[PDB]
Write a protein that binds this ligand. Structure first.
Ligand SMILES: Nc1ncccc1OCc1ccccc1
Ligand SMILES: Nc1ncccc1OCc1ccccc1
Ligand SMILES: Nc1ncccc1OCc1ccccc1
Ligand SMILES: Nc1ncccc1OCc1ccccc1
Ligand SMILES: Nc1ncccc1OCc1ccccc1
Ligand SMILES: Nc1ncccc1OCc1ccccc1
Lengths: 219, 219, 219, 219, 219, 219
């Protein structure tokens, strides 16, 4: 990654063993549960495109997902190149060349180049641009690997309301509902999908109940 | 987080793998036992609003609680905006804009903005303001998830007084009794809820007994 | 805690995940065995009153002990206030106010205030003052939770003398005998409580035997 | 490795216990699964040729692979010497000598020499040159140890398409197909090797289907 | 401990959690096997007398040994005071007082005092003086807890010579034979205590055989 | 060890808990498998003779090996003293004395002396000189503890060629064959010791086959 040291200049630092192992172990343990994504983002704080490729290449299984991700990256790299075409032919001696999509993705750029862009005044933030492409891809994978529709999350007859709500919102998160819809669903599908006893209690509460209110009501 | 480095200037540092894992593992192991909250506070020392969102987003289960928390945050953000309305329309070139509720919560502000506020002279402490909203929410969750009323903590016939007192005060903590009431309860409900043999001993001690005195008396 | 950095000025540093986990795990594993206290002291090296409260608040069980500790702290805070009364009414603009008992205990003081006191020339050592109150309380808890009188530690008929001595001194430590008495007991209660065969050997050694001499004698 | 310190000069630092253990444990756990290679590269960030030899020499099993690797290194070292012959006879007093293949590989050069080359202006990047030879060798080993042809990865009758695709691309990675072929295979061998039910669905999708599209189609 | 920081001045640093846990776990796992002593020495590198007491006080079992150690420390402290008597009555304002035995042992000196002595030009090395007393005591404990005389280590009839030699020298180390005697024993007691078949082989080798020679001979 | 700090001067640093534990655990887990030696070398990067003795003294078992090592060290120390005799009688006030064999080995030199030699301009590299003696000794131990002649490593009838080659080269490494012989053995003993089916295949390949070629041939 690129860090500020103890004296305020941005320098390259090697990716640490602890970060490398943390990422590999979260993918091993959680696969593409939605909470893997914020973990990836955090673990890649300050990353170069080299570092991001390191992290992705250290994954051993999930190769269908990693091929899907490559496809998304290639789509974004192609959109970059549409928006920001670069001069063909020789670079000015000693001067910084403009990055292409594949340079942002780390496949045609050197570490030195990357460092140069990321530490330019002002920075050409190749690591953040690439990390956004990656995360776009990873979100597609999360959606793909979500096993259950929201329509199929219904409260069992002896299921504590809290356990049902946990299932409900875990599902909505993997299915990638907007925050609008998660906020909204409390007045709709959450009640509809509740068991008869709790449905009756929630219906009587009236509209505008907070989730806390609904949860206390059906405790 | 924002740290002072080895030379006394406040700079951004990436959240460490160790902090990220510590938080995820405490939620995994303790759920919303009350002692999770001081742990969250400590682990988020120096945090930006970005960091706080990272920590909260890395939680994989407990999604009913995380939706409740979002609701509390939105209520506090709305109260902020009531108290501190911001100018609509264009910001002064190069100048710091005033934060809105959603900027404090990290959803509409960049990391750079956050850094700017937190390192301003004097600081606009967006990470501490947000952390207070979070903790308000988390305390509600703790209360929600407390399984037992204080009224139902009664000393068994062969239960060592110390084990009863441990249950009693663990309950009072999750139920969120004030320190007044925890201090006071030693003269009241603690005795009332003691088994007959210990109740007799405690009654004879007289008023004003310290907890230590009561515990020695019923050992 | 407050640390000297790499250039010799005292600055605040966040409590580390490793320190937070070390404390929680020692209480989990050892409860209030006497050796928990020096561990607490060491783990709280440099602590602010905020840090000390963090450590104590991260404990999840043992709430009878934690309520006893609060009581001891309140007694010491009251004695502080008797000895060092503070001016009522407004503080001099920009100037350091004098700490009250509850400010030393971290309940009515900010982190900034604490830092200010601890880094004043000369320091008002609020973290060390509070740590002493805490340790006074913790020593009471250790004594409370000591399960066995010294009078009941007697060497079994087939018990190796060394194993008996280990029990004996472990007990004396939890019971909180002075070093005088631990030094002295070798000529008295240690022999008295030895089995017949070893008692005979020790009696013949004469007075003034070192523990090493007694242990070799009964090997 | 060679690091920039906190003040921007490149200095030697000892290889850390954590890096040494991370490498040994990845070889122990993963052998020569393809994802070991990016791990080796990352763990050897900044390495001297001494460090690279340390890492390779700390491996205890897999000695057929380590002998193959020595052979590849010797081939590359011989090609170096063909391309960059060095002056025979005495070096200029106090001056940097030119590296031979065996000096790049760390067998005839001192650590000091290595440091000298790597920190020269401009650097003679002996650690990166050697790391490339190593990785050339390791890729041969990965191919050698790949247990299954791509021709033999066929979707079972009750095998979820996603699990088949994972096997398929894991195989292609160990077999060392180019990215061309991995990108291309989605229109060919992937469909051909799919079970009858999914083959029918994929055939109907038409050409140009993304992997995501194919995976959704056969879910 | 007292460390040089990144700029070459000697400053106090808190004892780390990792050092505190390492010591407690080595005593837990190895008790007073001889190799605990060099571990203690290494873990206490740079220690103040405060730190050494911390380490010793964090030990929970082995209280007969810890009382023996206190006795040895008191004997050395008394010998110090015989050799280096201090002025009674008031210290020169602002000036460093001379340490007494109990000040070296950390029982009557403050951390500040200790720091002062250890960082004086030239240092009064109170931590090294005390560490020597401690190690004198610990060596007595090792000898005490050694379970077997060297006379009783004899090679079994089917015991590999190497396993016998390992037992032999492990015993000699716990029994605290000088290096003279360990060097010498190869010509004497080692052969005498060997089984008949190996004894015959060793006798024929002649005098002056190295241990390596003896071990190869009886392989 | 001696390190360069963050500002480029060579200073002493305490051996870390992590390094101390890493060494003890590798000896515990691997004994004197050949790969322990490069691990020892790496873990002792920058070591003083004090540090090297610490590492060796922290080993609890294997005392026959540790006595053999002492013997080798004493032989090298005696050869040093033959080559580099030192002045008898008093040292020049304030000046650096010349090291004797036992000073290099850390038994008659102080840490301060060692530091002085290692940081002299130019250095008298006592830690590297001693580390070479140690490694000479450890290599003898590895050879001693190698359980099997190369002559006895023969491919079983159903043993995969790769598994045989792994055994073969693991053996050659413990037996301490030169790289000449390991390079050469591929044309000789490796084939001779192969099972009949693979022997026939290898014989037909002709001379000059690489190991990779031989391994592919017999897959
Ligand atoms: N293993 C990887 N998986 C997903 C994306 C990228 C990875 O590494 C880099 C890459 C990107 C695009 C094409 C080829 C390689
Ligand atoms: N997972 C989260 N859970 C609770 C609160 C906040 C979290 O992340 C940020 C957030 C806050 C409010 C609305 C949407 C997202
Ligand atoms: N959990 C705590 N337990 C014991 C003492 C203090 C703790 O935190 C601070 C405190 C002290 C006194 C009253 C209230 C809170
Ligand atoms: N164990 C090693 N294995 C593979 C390659 C290199 C290793 O160490 C260095 C080496 C290279 C070439 C010949 C001899 C030694
Ligand atoms: N637990 C201790 N055990 C052995 C020696 C010292 C220890 O702490 C300090 C001490 C030394 C002497 C008397 C009293 C206390
Ligand atoms: N345990 C040790 N084992 C092997 C060699 C050295 C060790 O420590 C130092 C030493 C060397 C020579 C004689 C005595 C002690």
């Amino acid at each position: 990654p690129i860090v500020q040291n103890l004296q305020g200049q941005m320098v390259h630092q090697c990716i640490s063993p602890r970060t490398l192992n943390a990422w590999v172990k979260v993918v091993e343990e959680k696969a593409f549960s939605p909470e893997v994504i914020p973990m990836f983002s955090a673990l890649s704080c300050g990353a170069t495109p080299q570092d991001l490729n390191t992290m992705l290449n250290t994954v051993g299984g999930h190769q269908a997902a990693m091929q899907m991700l490559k496809e998304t990256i290639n789509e974004e790299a192609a959109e970059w190149d549409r928006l920001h075409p670069v001069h063909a032919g020789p670079i000015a001696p000693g001067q910084m060349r403009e990055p292409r999509g594949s340079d942002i993705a780390g496949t045609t750029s050197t570490l030195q180049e990357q460092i140069g862009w990321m530490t330019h005044n002002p920075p050409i933030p190749v690591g953040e641009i690439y990390k956004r492409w990656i995360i776009l891809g990873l979100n597609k994978i999360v959606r793909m690997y979500s096993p259950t529709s929201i329509l199929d999350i219904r409260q069992g007859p002896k299921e504590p309301f809290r356990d049902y709500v946990d299932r409900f919102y875990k599902t909505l998160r993997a299915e990638q509902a907007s925050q609008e819809v998660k906020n909204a669903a409390t007045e709709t599908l959450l009640v509809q999908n509740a068991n008869p006893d709790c449905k009756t209690i929630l219906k009587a509460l009236g509209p505008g109940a907070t989730l806390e209110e609904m949860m206390t009501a059906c405790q």
